[PDB]
Each structure stands twice: as structure tokens, then as C-alpha cells.
Write a protein that holds these residues in place. Sequence first.
Motif, PDB file in Angstrom:
ATOM      1  N   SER B  32       0.788  -1.234   0.000  1.00 37.36           N
ATOM      2  CA  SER B  32       0.000   0.000   0.000  1.00 37.36           C
ATOM      3  C   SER B  32       0.822   1.287   0.000  1.00 37.36           C
ATOM      4  O   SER B  32       0.272   2.361   0.241  1.00 37.36           O
ATOM      5  CB  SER B  32      -0.887   0.015   1.242  1.00 37.36           C
ATOM      6  OG  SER B  32      -0.095   0.220   2.406  1.00 37.36           O
ATOM      7  N   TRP B  33       2.124   1.190  -0.272  1.00 36.47           N
ATOM      8  CA  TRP B  33       3.027   2.343  -0.159  1.00 36.47           C
ATOM      9  C   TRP B  33       3.090   3.231  -1.399  1.00 36.47           C
ATOM     10  O   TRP B  33       4.152   3.427  -2.001  1.00 36.47           O
ATOM     11  CB  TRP B  33       4.432   1.910   0.276  1.00 36.47           C
ATOM     12  CG  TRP B  33       4.584   1.921   1.750  1.00 36.47           C
ATOM     13  CD1 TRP B  33       4.761   0.849   2.564  1.00 36.47           C
ATOM     14  CD2 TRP B  33       4.542   3.072   2.599  1.00 36.47           C
ATOM     15  NE1 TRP B  33       4.841   1.262   3.872  1.00 36.47           N
ATOM     16  CE2 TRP B  33       4.710   2.624   3.920  1.00 36.47           C
ATOM     17  CE3 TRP B  33       4.373   4.439   2.370  1.00 36.47           C
ATOM     18  CZ2 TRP B  33       4.715   3.497   5.012  1.00 36.47           C
ATOM     19  CZ3 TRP B  33       4.385   5.308   3.461  1.00 36.47           C
ATOM     20  CH2 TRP B  33       4.553   4.833   4.759  1.00 36.47           C
ATOM     21  N   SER B  34       1.909   3.691  -1.806  1.00 36.16           N
ATOM     22  CA  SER B  34       1.704   5.054  -2.292  1.00 36.16           C
ATOM     23  C   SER B  34       2.725   5.534  -3.332  1.00 36.16           C
ATOM     24  O   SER B  34       2.879   4.928  -4.393  1.00 36.16           O
ATOM     25  CB  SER B  34       1.700   6.002  -1.062  1.00 36.16           C
ATOM     26  OG  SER B  34       0.870   5.531  -0.006  1.00 36.16           O
ATOM     27  N   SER B  35       3.430   6.611  -2.982  1.00 42.80           N
ATOM     28  CA  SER B  35       4.348   7.312  -3.856  1.00 42.80           C
ATOM     29  C   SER B  35       5.762   7.241  -3.284  1.00 42.80           C
ATOM     30  O   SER B  35       6.485   8.235  -3.241  1.00 42.80           O
ATOM     31  CB  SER B  35       3.890   8.759  -3.959  1.00 42.80           C
ATOM     32  OG  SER B  35       2.554   8.808  -4.439  1.00 42.80           O
ATOM     33  N   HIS B  36       6.124   6.052  -2.810  1.00 39.26           N
ATOM     34  CA  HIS B  36       7.476   5.742  -2.374  1.00 39.26           C
ATOM     35  C   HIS B  36       7.828   4.382  -2.948  1.00 39.26           C
ATOM     36  O   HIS B  36       7.040   3.791  -3.690  1.00 39.26           O
ATOM     37  CB  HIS B  36       7.565   5.706  -0.849  1.00 39.26           C
ATOM     38  CG  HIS B  36       7.029   6.932  -0.184  1.00 39.26           C
ATOM     39  ND1 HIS B  36       5.681   7.136   0.014  1.00 39.26           N
ATOM     40  CD2 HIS B  36       7.656   8.014   0.337  1.00 39.26           C
ATOM     41  CE1 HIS B  36       5.500   8.292   0.629  1.00 39.26           C
ATOM     42  NE2 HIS B  36       6.684   8.845   0.837  1.00 39.26           N
ATOM     43  N   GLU B  37       9.007   3.886  -2.600  1.00 40.47           N
ATOM     44  CA  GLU B  37       9.466   2.601  -3.086  1.00 40.47           C
ATOM     45  C   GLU B  37       9.857   1.677  -1.926  1.00 40.47           C
ATOM     46  O   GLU B  37      10.978   1.746  -1.410  1.00 40.47           O
ATOM     47  CB  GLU B  37      10.643   2.824  -4.017  1.00 40.47           C
ATOM     48  CG  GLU B  37      11.097   1.567  -4.716  1.00 40.47           C
ATOM     49  CD  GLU B  37      12.594   1.463  -4.789  1.00 40.47           C
ATOM     50  OE1 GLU B  37      13.279   1.972  -3.875  1.00 40.47           O
ATOM     51  OE2 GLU B  37      13.088   0.854  -5.758  1.00 40.47           O
ATOM     52  N   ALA B  38       8.930   0.807  -1.525  1.00 35.42           N
ATOM     53  CA  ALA B  38       9.154  -0.091  -0.381  1.00 35.42           C
ATOM     54  C   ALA B  38      10.011  -1.310  -0.721  1.00 35.42           C
ATOM     55  O   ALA B  38      10.575  -1.938   0.165  1.00 35.42           O
ATOM     56  CB  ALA B  38       7.826  -0.545   0.196  1.00 35.42           C
ATOM     57  N   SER B  39      10.104  -1.636  -2.006  1.00 40.60           N
ATOM     58  CA  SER B  39      10.748  -2.871  -2.460  1.00 40.60           C
ATOM     59  C   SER B  39      12.269  -2.889  -2.330  1.00 40.60           C
ATOM     60  O   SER B  39      12.873  -3.956  -2.229  1.00 40.60           O
ATOM     61  CB  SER B  39      10.385  -3.145  -3.928  1.00 40.60           C
ATOM     62  OG  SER B  39       9.040  -3.572  -4.051  1.00 40.60           O
ATOM     63  N   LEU B  40      12.894  -1.721  -2.343  1.00 40.78           N
ATOM     64  CA  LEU B  40      14.338  -1.651  -2.532  1.00 40.78           C
ATOM     65  C   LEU B  40      15.052  -1.186  -1.272  1.00 40.78           C
ATOM     66  O   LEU B  40      16.160  -0.659  -1.335  1.00 40.78           O
ATOM     67  CB  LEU B  40      14.646  -0.728  -3.713  1.00 40.78           C
ATOM     68  CG  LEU B  40      15.779  -1.080  -4.676  1.00 40.78           C
ATOM     69  CD1 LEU B  40      15.393  -2.265  -5.583  1.00 40.78           C
ATOM     70  CD2 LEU B  40      16.138   0.152  -5.488  1.00 40.78           C
ATOM     71  N   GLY B  41      14.412  -1.400  -0.127  1.00 34.64           N
ATOM     72  CA  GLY B  41      15.053  -1.198   1.168  1.00 34.64           C
ATOM     73  C   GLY B  41      15.771  -2.447   1.658  1.00 34.64           C
ATOM     74  O   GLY B  41      15.429  -2.979   2.723  1.00 34.64           O
ATOM     75  N   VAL B  42      16.759  -2.913   0.883  1.00 32.58           N
ATOM     76  CA  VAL B  42      17.577  -4.086   1.256  1.00 32.58           C
ATOM     77  C   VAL B  42      19.046  -3.688   1.436  1.00 32.58           C
ATOM     78  O   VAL B  42      19.467  -2.609   1.012  1.00 32.58           O
ATOM     79  CB  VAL B  42      17.458  -5.267   0.234  1.00 32.58           C
ATOM     80  CG1 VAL B  42      16.150  -5.198  -0.529  1.00 32.58           C
ATOM     81  CG2 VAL B  42      18.629  -5.295  -0.727  1.00 32.58           C
ATOM     82  N   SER B  43      19.816  -4.558   2.082  1.00 32.16           N
ATOM     83  CA  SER B  43      21.233  -4.298   2.306  1.00 32.16           C
ATOM     84  C   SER B  43      22.010  -5.590   2.457  1.00 32.16           C
ATOM     85  O   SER B  43      21.546  -6.534   3.100  1.00 32.16           O
ATOM     86  CB  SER B  43      21.432  -3.439   3.555  1.00 32.16           C
ATOM     87  OG  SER B  43      22.797  -3.096   3.735  1.00 32.16           O
ATOM     88  N   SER B  44      23.205  -5.603   1.870  1.00 30.30           N
ATOM     89  CA  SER B  44      24.126  -6.735   1.955  1.00 30.30           C
ATOM     90  C   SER B  44      24.573  -7.023   3.380  1.00 30.30           C
ATOM     91  O   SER B  44      25.128  -8.084   3.644  1.00 30.30           O
ATOM     92  CB  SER B  44      25.370  -6.452   1.127  1.00 30.30           C
ATOM     93  OG  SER B  44      26.094  -5.377   1.702  1.00 30.30           O
ATOM     94  N   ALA B  45      24.364  -6.069   4.286  1.00 27.66           N
ATOM     95  CA  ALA B  45      24.644  -6.278   5.705  1.00 27.66           C
ATOM     96  C   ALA B  45      23.772  -7.386   6.273  1.00 27.66           C
ATOM     97  O   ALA B  45      24.156  -8.034   7.240  1.00 27.66           O
ATOM     98  CB  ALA B  45      24.430  -4.989   6.493  1.00 27.66           C
ATOM     99  N   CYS B  46      22.606  -7.599   5.664  1.00 30.62           N
ATOM    100  CA  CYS B  46      21.638  -8.572   6.155  1.00 30.62           C
ATOM    101  C   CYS B  46      21.269  -9.599   5.097  1.00 30.62           C
ATOM    102  O   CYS B  46      20.199  -9.508   4.491  1.00 30.62           O
ATOM    103  CB  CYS B  46      20.409  -7.832   6.645  1.00 30.62           C
ATOM    104  SG  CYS B  46      20.873  -6.728   7.984  1.00 30.62           S
ATOM    105  N   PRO B  47      22.150 -10.601   4.897  1.00 25.98           N
ATOM    106  CA  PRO B  47      22.042 -11.565   3.803  1.00 25.98           C
ATOM    107  C   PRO B  47      21.050 -12.701   4.052  1.00 25.98           C
ATOM    108  O   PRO B  47      21.057 -13.317   5.119  1.00 25.98           O
ATOM    109  CB  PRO B  47      23.463 -12.124   3.702  1.00 25.98           C
ATOM    110  CG  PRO B  47      23.967 -12.082   5.085  1.00 25.98           C
ATOM    111  CD  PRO B  47      23.334 -10.876   5.735  1.00 25.98           C
ATOM    112  N   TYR B  48      20.223 -12.974   3.048  1.00 25.01           N
ATOM    113  CA  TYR B  48      19.254 -14.058   3.092  1.00 25.01           C
ATOM    114  C   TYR B  48      19.339 -14.872   1.800  1.00 25.01           C
ATOM    115  O   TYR B  48      18.926 -14.401   0.736  1.00 25.01           O
ATOM    116  CB  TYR B  48      17.849 -13.486   3.263  1.00 25.01           C
ATOM    117  CG  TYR B  48      16.764 -14.530   3.248  1.00 25.01           C
ATOM    118  CD1 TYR B  48      16.733 -15.530   4.213  1.00 25.01           C
ATOM    119  CD2 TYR B  48      15.766 -14.518   2.275  1.00 25.01           C
ATOM    120  CE1 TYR B  48      15.748 -16.496   4.212  1.00 25.01           C
ATOM    121  CE2 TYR B  48      14.770 -15.480   2.266  1.00 25.01           C
ATOM    122  CZ  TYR B  48      14.767 -16.470   3.241  1.00 25.01           C
ATOM    123  OH  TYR B  48      13.788 -17.436   3.249  1.00 25.01           O
TER     124      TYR B  48
END
Lengths: 180, 48
Positions: B32-48
Motif C-alpha cells: 500500500s506504499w503510495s508514492s514511495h518505493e518499499a521494495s528496494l530497502g535491502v542491504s548486503s549487511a543482512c544476507p538471506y
Amino acid sequence: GLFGAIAGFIEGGWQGMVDGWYGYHHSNEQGSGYAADKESTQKAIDGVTNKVNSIIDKMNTQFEAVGREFNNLERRIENLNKKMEDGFLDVWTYNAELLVLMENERTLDFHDSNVKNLYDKVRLQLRDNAKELGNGCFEFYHKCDNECMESVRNGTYDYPQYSEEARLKREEISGVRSLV
Amino acid sequence: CYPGDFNDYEELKHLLSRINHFEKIQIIPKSSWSSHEASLGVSSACPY
């Protein structure tokens, strides 16, 4: 319990001895009757009265808890405060119980010797002059009237005054005459 | 895994002392995140 007397060889106390804690009952030509030993009740009261005030004195420094107010996000020292006061109130509640439980045992046993030490007192005066009847009670050889009871009662009986009288009775209920 | 700090951490764990069961519910849908980008809040600091 420990000392042998109360609820022991002296089976049961008397309801007739109203004036005091331990005492005497006699029986002779003139009367029968009870008579409390005040001297040694008064000494026992001294000791119980002192015990009661002993405790009272010992718990004037006992832990007093005045309260503290605490925040929403100080929750875990609010707790520390609560753990402490609940802590001390358990430690002193234990103490106050255990002391009573312990002093009660000591007190009931204090009477127990009180009685017995009275008896042994009577016993050491009246020696050969009386029979230890074995249920708390002595019968005399020599016949002993009221004024002479007192002496036993107030611990100044006189062995060498009724000696012959008594040991004429010992001499005969020993069947020793019966050879002439 | 991404480093930093948890503000008032212990005060929480203590509050977690009294709780026997959670139930995770959704309050803000990621979709539901509107006019932002919620998908690309990732970081190599936290690997999965």
C-alpha cells in the motif's frame, strides 16, 4: 515434654488451685486443701513478662517502608523496589513467626521444670521422714499438722524434729518388731 | 545485522517477561506504499 512433670508423672493439673500457677495440696487430721506457691509463680511471671517485653524491644528498629512513585518506562526499577520491600517483609515475617514458635517451646518447657524443681525441693527436705508415693505426692511417716505443712510449703521443714516419730513408723512397717 | 541500537531495549524485554503469547497482525501493508518505493530497502549487511 522435656522435663518430666506437666503432663507427666503429675497426671493433670488441678482446677481447684485458682490463685496461681504451681502449688501444693495437703491432707491431714485438721483439713484438706489447696494452696498456690506464690513465690515461684511470681518468679515465673517475672520471666515471662520479661520475655514479652524482650521481643517488643527487639523490634523497634524493624524495617519501615515509606513508598516511592514510579514512571511508565522505569518499570524495571519499580520492580526492583517492589522486590525489595516484598523481600524484607518476608524476612521479618519469617523472623517474627519463627521467634514465637521458638519461644513458645522454651516457655512451655520452662513451666515443666518449674513444677519439677518444686517437687524435688519438697523431696530434698522431707527425706526418710516421708514416702515418695510416685504420682506427685508424699505421705509422711510422722503425722504432720497445718503449722508443719507451712514449713514444707515455705521450705523450712525440720527433719531432726520429727525424726524419732517418723523412724518409729519406719521401724515398724518394716515388720522388724515381729520377732518378739 | 544492520548495526545500530534498540532504544529502551531492557525496559521492553522486562515487559516481555509478563507476556505469554503474541499475535503478529498487519498494520501497514508493504503493498500500500503510495508514492514511495518499499521494495528496494535491502542491504548486503543482512544476507538471506
